[PDB]
Amino acid sequence: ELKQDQYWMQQAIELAKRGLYSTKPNPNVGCVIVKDDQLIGEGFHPKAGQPHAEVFALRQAGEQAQGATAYVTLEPCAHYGRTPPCAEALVKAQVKKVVVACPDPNPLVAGKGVQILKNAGIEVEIGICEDLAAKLNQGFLKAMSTGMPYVRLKVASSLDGRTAMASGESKWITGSAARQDVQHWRAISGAVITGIDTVIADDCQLNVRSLHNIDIETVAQPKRVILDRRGRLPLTAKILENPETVMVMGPYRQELADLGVIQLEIQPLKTLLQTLSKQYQIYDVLIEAGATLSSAFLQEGLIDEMISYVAPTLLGQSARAMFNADFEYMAQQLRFKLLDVIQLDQDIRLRLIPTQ
Template sequence: MTAADPTAADQELMARAVRLAARGLFTTDPNPRVGCVLVQAGDVVGEGWHRRAGEAHAERIALAAAGPRARGSTAYVTLEPCCHQGRTPPCTQALIEAGVATVHCAMVDPNPLVFGQGLAALRAAGIQVRTGLLEAEARGLNPGFIKRMSSGLPYCRCKLAASLDGRTAMASGESRWISSEFSRLDVQHLRARHSAIVTGVGTLLGDNPSLNVRLAAADLPGMEPDEPVRQPWRVVVDTRLRTPAGARLLGLPGITVIACSAPADQRRVSQLELAGARVKQFPDHHGLVDLRALMSWLAEEEINEVLLETGPILAGAALTGGLIDELILYLAPHLMGDGARGLFQLPGLEHMEHRIPLIIDDVRRIGPDLRLLLRPGTAGAR
C-alpha cells in the first residue's frame, strides 16, 4: 500500500512526526533528523525524536513511552527504521519485538546499510508497511544526509548579503554592515543547523570573521536551555596558506580546517596547527583548491550541510562547479554603486544565452531586508 491510500488522520499523524523530527534540527548531526508517533485505537500512546548521535533513535524513544500499549499499534516514522547495529541497536528489531502492527514510513533511508532492508525486515515479520506519506516534507528535513548518502557530497548553501543593486562590498572591501541586525540574527540560526561553514582566505584576511554560532541553546527550538550549542566546522579555503596564526577563528571552540593546495610549507603548517587548525592539502584546480575534492572529503568526514560564506571568487567557483544546491540572498534596501563588488565572479558570461538561471523558492521579509531562497536552474527555466 502506498501514499495514495492515507486518511486525513494518517496525514495529521505523519505531520506530527515531521514536527517532532524538526526538533532535532540543531542537535542530531551527523545523523538524520527523525520523528516517530505510535497510535493505538486512535490515541497517541508514544512519540519521540532523535536528539543526537549515539542516543536512542526516535522509534525506541516512542516505544519506551508506549510500553505495553505499543502492541498492535501503528507507527508513523519519517525515515525507514534502521536494520543494522550502529552506535545503537536496530530499530526494526525493536518494532518487531514490541508487536507493532503497521508502520507508515515517509521515505526510504538512502544509507546503503539500510536502503529498503529495514522495510523488508518489517514485512518479513508480518508487519504491514506503507511508504511515501509526506515524503517531500520528510526529505526536506535531511537534504544533507540524503545527498551525502546518495552522491558522496554534502548539501551546500551559499549565503550572501547584498544591496539592491547586487553589491556585497565597497571597492575598498568595506562591507559592515550591508544587511540589518534582523538578517544577521537569521544567519545565526542558519549557521546553527549546518555541519560546516566554508569561507575563503580573502574574506578571512579582509574581515577576520569568527564564523561561529553566537546563540544560546534557549534561542534554538528543540534544545534544552542548558545544552551546549554545537559549533559547525570552520573551513578556510587558503591555497597558499596565507591564514595568519592570530586569526580570530583559530582561538574559538570547535574544529577549524585550513584547506590548501600549494606544496605545504611545514613551518607554516606547524604554526597554524599550534594555533589550533587542522591543515589539509587538496589537489590543485586551475591554481585554486579543488572545491569538489574538498566537498567530497567533508562528506567523508560526515559533514551533511555546508554553508558557504565567502566573497565573489570562491562563490563563483562553487556555483560554476555545480556545487551549490541553494542560494540564500539577503537584499538590503540601499544602493552601493557600480564601483562596488558584485555577488559572484563569473568570467566568460558574454551573451544573454550564457546567463545562469535561478529558481526562486521563497521570498520573505526579514526586518527591512528581503530574504530570497533560490536554486540553480536549467537553461530556459522560468
C-alpha cells in the same frame, strides 16, 4: 485514511524538527505511535549517540505499543551503529503497522529495516509525506545517496547587486535580523566554508553563538573550513579560538598542527566537498565567502541552494559585484528557481535553487 496517515506523519515531521541544531551527522527523525486513533508515544532524535526517535516513542508507548501503528519520518534502521536497530525494537514492541516517510537514503541499507519489519509480519507503508519529510534532512539524504553534501551559499548584496565599495572594509549593508537568520543556516550546517580573504578582512568566526530559545551548548557546531592556499592564516585570527573545529585547506603548517587544526590537502572545490562528506561526515555545507570563491562555487555548479540577503540600498555601478562572471549573451545567465522570499526587518532573503 491516507489523510489519517498523512496527519500522523506530519506530527512526526514536527517532532523531527526538535533536534535540528544538535543531530548532525545523524539525521532528524521523528516518531509517533498511534494505538486506537490515539497518540500514545512521541520521540525525536536529539543528538548523535543518543537513542533514535523510535526508541523514545516506544518507551512512551510501553506495553501499549502492541498492535499499535508507528509513524517514522525515516526507515527504521536495521544495523547496529552507535545504537541498536529500531526495526528490531519495533518487532519486540509487537506493533501492527509501520508508516515510513523516507526510505533509508543509503542504498546499501535501503529497505533492510522494511525487510525485518515485513518478516516479523508487520505491515509497512512508505512514501507518505516523503517530500515534506525529506525537507528535514536535505544534506543527509543527498550525502547518503550521492556521496556529496547539500551546499548552501550565503550572499548579501544591495538592491543593485553589489556588496562593497572597496574590499577589506568590513562594512555591513544588511541588518541584525539577517545576522540572526544566518545563525539558523550555520546551526544546521556541518561546515561553514569561507576563503582566507574573508578571515583576514573581517576576523570572522563563522560559528553559532545565538539562536532564540536554544542554548549554544546544545548546538552541534559547524566546522569552520578555511580555504587558504598560500597559508596566510594568522594564528591571532578569532576563528582559531576553538582550533578543534577549524579545518584549513592549504600548505601543511606545523603551527596549525600544534593547535589541533585539521589540515586538508589542496583539492578542487568539488573534491573538497566530497572529502568533507566521506571523511568528516559533513552533509550540509554553508558557504560564506567573498565574490571570487562564491562565483567559483556557482560557476562550477556546486551550489544546491543560494540564500540571498538583499539590503534596501543602492551602491552604484563602481561598487564590488556580488558575482564575478563575465557573461556576453543573455543565454549565459545563471537562472534559479525561487523557493521563497521573506522579509527580515529592512532586508529580504531569497532562497534559490539552480534550474537546468
